[PDB]
Amino acid sequence: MGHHHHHHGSTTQRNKQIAMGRKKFNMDPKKGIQFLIENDLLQSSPEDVAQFLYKGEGLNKTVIGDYLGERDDFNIKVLQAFVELHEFADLNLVQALRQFLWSFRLPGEAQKIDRMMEAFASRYCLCNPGVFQSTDTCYVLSFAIIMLNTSLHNHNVRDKPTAERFITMNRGINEGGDLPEELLRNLYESIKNEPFKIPEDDGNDLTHTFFNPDREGWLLKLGGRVKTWKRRWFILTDNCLYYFEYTTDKEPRGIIPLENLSIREVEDPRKPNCFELYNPSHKGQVIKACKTEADGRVVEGNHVVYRISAPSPEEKEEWMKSIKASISRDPFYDMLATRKRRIANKKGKVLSKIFGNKEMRILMLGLDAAGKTTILYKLKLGQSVTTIPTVGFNVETVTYKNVKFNVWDVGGLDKIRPLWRHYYTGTQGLIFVVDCADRDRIDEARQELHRIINDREMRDAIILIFANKQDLPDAMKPHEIQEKLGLTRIRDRNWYVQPSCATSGDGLYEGLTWLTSNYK
Ligand SMILES: Nc1nc2c(ncn2[C@@H]2O[C@H](COP(=O)(O)OP(=O)(O)OP(=O)(O)O)[C@@H](O)[C@H]2O)c(=O)[nH]1
Ligand SMILES: O=P(O)(O)O[C@H]1[C@H](O)[C@@H](OP(=O)(O)O)[C@H](OP(=O)(O)O)[C@@H](OP(=O)(O)O)[C@H]1O
Ligand SMILES: [Mg+2]
């Protein structure tokens, strides 16, 4: 182009809104219809909503029936307009029912069925005057036809009615008199030859493969220290906001754990539809995040805010609503920030560059509840804290006996584990933490450990196992852990099992001592 002017194409955003509206409708018809109206994709009149449902493009027909059956004044009007879009003139009652029953699936509730079939019968009689002496006659015969369809075509009904049985069953239905024999015979024969074809409701799959996502879409984002704008594909899921360079990427460019953040609308002189992620309680403090460098190594973010531009005000509103709903809120996060800041030493920079001290990159992994975060902050803050499950990661640098340990504590919940591999690059020591009282999950821990250490990026890492929770009754001892984690086989790697109690601190310094002694 020569000018990198950021322009998105209307086709992208409009098709996305169309797809969004349909998705919403299929979950909740009232909410989908409201979304489409707000997004100027549907007009608000009963007639306009009726045309939308009648076309029913990509709409669940059971959901259409649910909505049309409702007692609401608006819904009643939609229903009448819906039946008016059906042309029943010059069709017999079976043929008219075939048509109508293609357009929606009958709801289960008797009062809803009645409203819809009354509306149908009224429409049929207006289209075909003189055929039936009343709407009631038409309505009742419609159900005689439906019952016939069941009797003839459902194998659970043993005795199949003949034409003559169907004719005589309907004696007197025409306001006391009989309908024409040949009319009833024609209806019978039509149903006998072809059952009602019913649109059975389907299910569709998802486009991408990542974690089940709350929202995804393209946004422009401003850099941290270097204030440059980049187009990124964002995925919001499981209390984390991820971003990628391309939809085809299979690893994130950035990860933002949504811990005690807030959202504000901002005005920007050059980009439209902007909002910011920020921490209201710690103004000016760096937001926890990580991003990938050219060589694949994950590093900490430098943002005090995340300014983001959406391609439309509608998508801005969607993203703000979604992100707000996905924020993990908890005093724990404020507790960590406050305690860290108190013992924050500015001098550490001027001393770290002077001692020019080398250090050690650590990846700390293990099943959820193993004790990882407790260990991290026991080391970082010199105290045992009451933790909550980690949705993304925690990262802290700890100085211990002349070595600076950069420790990445990654969440161990099921859903997060496929992401562990992301953090491998650059790892010099693995800390694998195990709950020694959890015999139900020790084999699972073994499986995870070996997947990690067999990875091409983890071949050189020394391995420290924290055999944690030694304070608990009947907790597995280090020798049992050695066996149960299958470490005895592995004779070509440098590993050690350190007994620990993270809550008292027992064994933690001993583990860090081992790391320093064995790192080459
Ligand atoms: N009895 C006992 N409990 C511990 C010990 N260490 C940690 N815990 C407790 O175990 C629970 C989980 O500990 P966490 O540090 O949050 O575990 P985690 O590995 O970070 O879990 P994720 O964040 O899901 O990955 C918490 O209630 C801790 O207080 C220990 O040595 N003994
Ligand atoms: O691409 P250039 O112009 O060099 O600038 C980069 C990008 O804006 C990065 O965004 P992305 O990671 O999406 O590529 C950003 O990382 P963030 O992802 O943390 O915003 C960097 O922030 P700093 O490293 O803070 O300067 C910034 O230096
Ligand atoms: Mg944790």
User: Quick one: 162 and 30 in the same domain?
Assistant: yes
Please tell me the number of the ligand nearest to residue 377's CA.
1
- Single-letter amino acid code for the residue at 453: I
What 8-state DSSP symbol labels residue 328?
A: B
Task: Find the angle CA(95)-CA(99)-CA(103) to the nearest 5 degrees.
Answer: 160
Residue 199 lies in a domain: no
User: Quick one: 310 and 338 in the same domain?
Assistant: no
Sheet with 429-435, strands from edge to edge, namely: 393-400, 403-410, 359-365, 429-435, 462-468, 495-499
Rounded to 5 degrees, φ, ψ at 161 are -70, 140
Give the end of a domain, one of 159, 193, 227: 193
Residue 200 lies in a domain: no
- Single-letter amino acid code for the residue at 449: L
Nearest residue (by CA) to ligand 2, atom 1, is 228
Residue 1 lies in a domain: no
Q: Are the beta carbons of 97 and 196 closer than 8 angstroms?
A: yes
For 182, half-sphere exposure in the C-beta direction (CA atoms, 13 angstrom radius) is 0
Q: Which two tokens stand for residue 380?
A: 């970082």
3-class secondary structure, 189: helix
381 C-alpha vs ligand 2 centroid, how far in Å?
A: 30
User: Quick one: 473 and 420 in the same domain?
Assistant: yes
CA distance 101 to 65: 10
Q: Are the beta carbons of 364 and 433 closer than 8 angstroms?
A: yes
378 C-alpha vs ligand 3 centroid, how far in Å?
A: 12
Contacts 24+ apart (CB under 8 A), 237-241: 237/210, 237/211, 237/212, 237/213, 238/211, 238/391, 238/415, 238/416, 239/326, 239/327, 239/328, 239/391, 239/392, 240/391, 240/392, 241/277, 241/323, 241/326
* Residues forming a β-bridge with 290: 255, 300
CATH number at 278 reads: 2.30.29.30
Q: Are the beta carbons of 427 and 410 closer than 8 angstroms?
A: no
Give the end of a domain, one of 329, 364, 380: 329
User: Quick one: 313 and 362 in the same domain?
Assistant: no
Alpha carbon dihedral 293, 298, 304, 308, in 10-degree steps, equals: 60
Q: Are the beta carbons of 173 and 187 closer than 8 angstroms?
A: no
Residue 233 lies in a domain: yes
Ligand 1: which of 374, 407, 448, 504 to mutate, judged by most atoms within 8 Å of the beta carbon? Answer: 374
Please tell me the number of the ligand nearest to residue 234's CA.
2
3-class secondary structure, 430: strand
Q: Which residue has the tokens 């974690």?
A: 211
User: Quick one: 273 and 385 in the same domain?
Assistant: no
Phi-psi region of 402 (alpha: psi -120 to 50; beta: other; left: phi over 0): left
372 C-alpha vs ligand 3 centroid, how far in Å?
A: 5
CA distance 374 to 360: 20
CA distance 376 to 41: 52
User: Quick one: 377 and 432 in the same domain?
Assistant: yes
* Residues forming a β-bridge with 309: 220, 274
Q: Which two tokens stand for residue 9?
A: 């194409």
CA distance 171 to 184: 10
Distances (CA, A) of 461 to 81, 103, 273, 313, 425: 70, 63, 46, 48, 11
Question: Is residue 476 within 6 Å of ligand 1 at its C-beta?
Answer: no
User: Quick one: 324 and 339 in the same domain?
Assistant: no
Q: Are the beta carbons of 511 and 497 closer than 8 angstroms?
A: no
3-class secondary structure, 458: helix
Q: Are the beta carbons of 308 and 220 closer than 8 angstroms?
A: yes
**With helix as H, strand as E and coil as C, how does 5-34 read?**
CCCCCHHHHHHHHHHHHHHHHHHCHHHHHH
Distances (CA, A) of 209 to 189, 249, 250, 251, 344: 50, 11, 9, 11, 41
370 C-alpha vs ligand 1 centroid, how far in Å?
A: 5
Question: Is residue 60 within 6 Å of ligand 1 at its C-beta?
Answer: no
* Residues forming a β-bridge with 230: 221
User: Quick one: 479 and 379 in the same domain?
Assistant: yes
Closest among 243, 256, 242, 210 to 395, alpha carbons compared: 256
For the CA of 224, the nearest atom of ligand 2: 25
Nearest residue (by CA) to ligand 2, atom 16, is 223
User: Quick one: 32 and 109 in the same domain?
Assistant: yes
Nearest residue (by CA) to ligand 1, atom 30, is 469
CATH number at 142 reads: 1.10.1000.11
For the CA of 254, the nearest atom of ligand 2: 18
Which stretches of 194-252 are DSSP H helices? none
Please tell me the number of the ligand nearest to residue 508's CA.
1
Task: Mention every residue, 6+ apart, whose C-beta is less than 8 A from residue 418.
Answer: none
Q: Are the beta carbons of 410 and 416 closer than 8 angstroms?
A: yes
371 C-alpha vs ligand 1 centroid, how far in Å?
A: 3
For the CA of 472, the nearest atom of ligand 1: 1
Which method resolved this structure?
cryo-EM
CA dihedral over 44, 45, 50, 52, signed as positive or negative:
negative
Residue 156 lies in a domain: yes
CA distance 494 to 447: 18
Question: Is residue 384 within 6 Å of ligand 1 at its C-beta?
Answer: no
Q: Which residue has the tokens 């991003």?
A: 291
Residue 73 lies in a domain: yes
What 8-state DSSP symbol labels residue 414?
A: G
Task: Find the angle CA(81)-CA(87)-CA(92) to the nearest 5 degrees.
Answer: 130
Rounded (10°) angle between helices 73-84 and 46-55:
60
3-class secondary structure, 8: coil
CA distance 322 to 47: 32
| Count, residues in the chain | 520
Distances (CA, A) of 87 to 4, 51, 82, 128: 54, 14, 11, 10
31 C-alpha vs ligand 1 centroid, how far in Å?
A: 42
DSSP annotation string for 256-310 = EE-BS-EEEEE--SSSSSEEEEE-SSSTTPPPP-EEE-TTS-EEE---S-EEEE-
User: Quick one: 371 and 268 in the same domain?
Assistant: no
CATH number at 429 reads: 3.40.50.300
Q: 150 lies in which domain range?
A: 12-193
Ligand 1: which of 381, 387, 508 to mutate, judged by most atoms within 8 Å of the beta carbon? Answer: 387
Residue 509 lies in a domain: yes
Task: Mention every residue, 6+ apart, whose C-beta is less than 8 A from residue 128.
Answer: 88, 89, 90, 91, 96
Nearest residue (by CA) to ligand 2, atom 10, is 223
Distances (CA, A) of 376 to 282, 316, 425, 502, 512: 22, 37, 20, 9, 12
Q: Are the beta carbons of 138 and 132 closer than 8 angstroms?
A: yes
Question: Is residue 374 within 6 Å of ligand 1 at its C-beta?
Answer: yes
Strand segments (E) across 358-453: 359-365, 393-400, 403-410, 429-435
46 C-alpha vs ligand 3 centroid, how far in Å?
A: 52
For the CA of 292, the nearest atom of ligand 2: 12
Task: Find the angle CA(226)-CA(293)-CA(421) to the nearest 5 degrees.
Answer: 140
Nearest residue (by CA) to ligand 1, atom 13, is 371
CA distance 53 to 55: 5
CA distance 352 to 289: 23
- Domain count across the chain: 3
3-class secondary structure, 254: strand
User: Quick one: 254 and 175 in the same domain?
Assistant: no
Task: Mention every residue, 6+ apart, whose C-beta is less than 8 A from residue 384.
Answer: 374, 377, 378, 502, 503, 504, 505
Give the end of a domain, one of 298, 329, 360: 329
425 C-alpha vs ligand 2 centroid, how far in Å?
A: 19
Distance linking the first and last C-alpha atoms of the chain: 50
CA distance 58 to 19: 9
Task: Mention every residue, 6+ apart, whose C-beta is less than 8 A from residue 145.
Answer: 93, 94, 97, 187, 191
For 68, half-sphere exposure in the C-beta direction (CA atoms, 13 angstrom radius) is 34
3-class secondary structure, 117: helix
Q: Ligand 2: residues within 6 Å at CB?
A: 223-226, 228, 230, 232, 253-254, 291, 301-302
Distances (CA, A) of 120 to 113, 138, 442, 453: 10, 9, 63, 68
Q: Are the beta carbons of 476 and 436 closer than 8 angstroms?
A: yes
363 C-alpha vs ligand 3 centroid, how far in Å?
A: 13
Classify residue 425 by burial, with Cβ atoms within 10 Å: 0-12, 13-18, 19+: middle
Resolution (A): 35.0
The alpha carbons of the chain give a radius of gyration, in whole angstroms, of: 33
* Residues forming a β-bridge with 495: 463
Residue 17 lies in a domain: yes
CA distance 113 to 359: 73
Ligand 2: which of 246, 288, 291 to mutate, judged by most atoms within 8 Å of the beta carbon? Answer: 291
Alpha-carbon 83 to chain mean position: 37
User: Quick one: 44 and 159 in the same domain?
Assistant: yes
